[PDB]
Amino acid sequence: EARPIVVGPPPPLSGGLPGTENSDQARDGTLPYTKDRFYLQPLPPTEAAQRAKVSASEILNVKQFIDRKAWPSLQNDLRLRASYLRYDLKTVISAKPKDEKKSLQELTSKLFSSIDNLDHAAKIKSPTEAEKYYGQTVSNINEVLAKLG
Structure with a gap:
């Protein structure tokens, strides 16, 4: 099965492996939102929200970039995530009239301005400013996410 299990003996101690020691298994290994639906059905703008x-x-x-102090990597890496998000959001907003949905696109724009600030904080080698703009990106992500509810 596609489950985190081994045919050999399990590791010792409780947790870190699947089990029913507690009400929660606390283990999955991966969390695919729709898995194979993308190859069975086309991608409508409603599921683009997922x-x-x-x-x-x-x-x-x-x-986790701040810990690794990955200054020259983030300037590319964050923008890759941002691009993926941009494409999906561009699709979600097309499912509604352009006027009301403008409100979401303004958050979508504000969010990316805080990404640019975090990219500059990374390049200027400042972990303090990276955390400062990390707090802003987290807030902007949450606000956009509520509009994807």
């Missing part, structure tokens, strides 16, 4: 909130969550993972 893809969008996943690619948005990658921007919440940017804190």
Whole structure:
């Protein structure tokens, strides 16, 4: 099965492996939102919202660049996540009249301005400013995510 399990003996101690030690298994290995639906059905703009909130969550993972102090990498890497998100959002907003949905696109724009600030903070080698703009990107992601509810 596609489950995190081994045919050999399990590792010792509780947790870190699947089990029923607690009410929660605390283990999955991967979390595919729609998995194979993309190859069975076309991608409508409604389900583009599902893809969008996943690619948005990658921007919440940017804190891990600060730890690794990956200054020359983030300037490319964050923009890759941003591009994926941009494409999906561009699709979601097309499912509604352009006027009301403008409100979402203004958040979509504000969010990317805070990405540019984090990219500059990375290039200027400042972890403090990287965390400062990380807080802003997290807020902007959350606000856009509520509009994808």
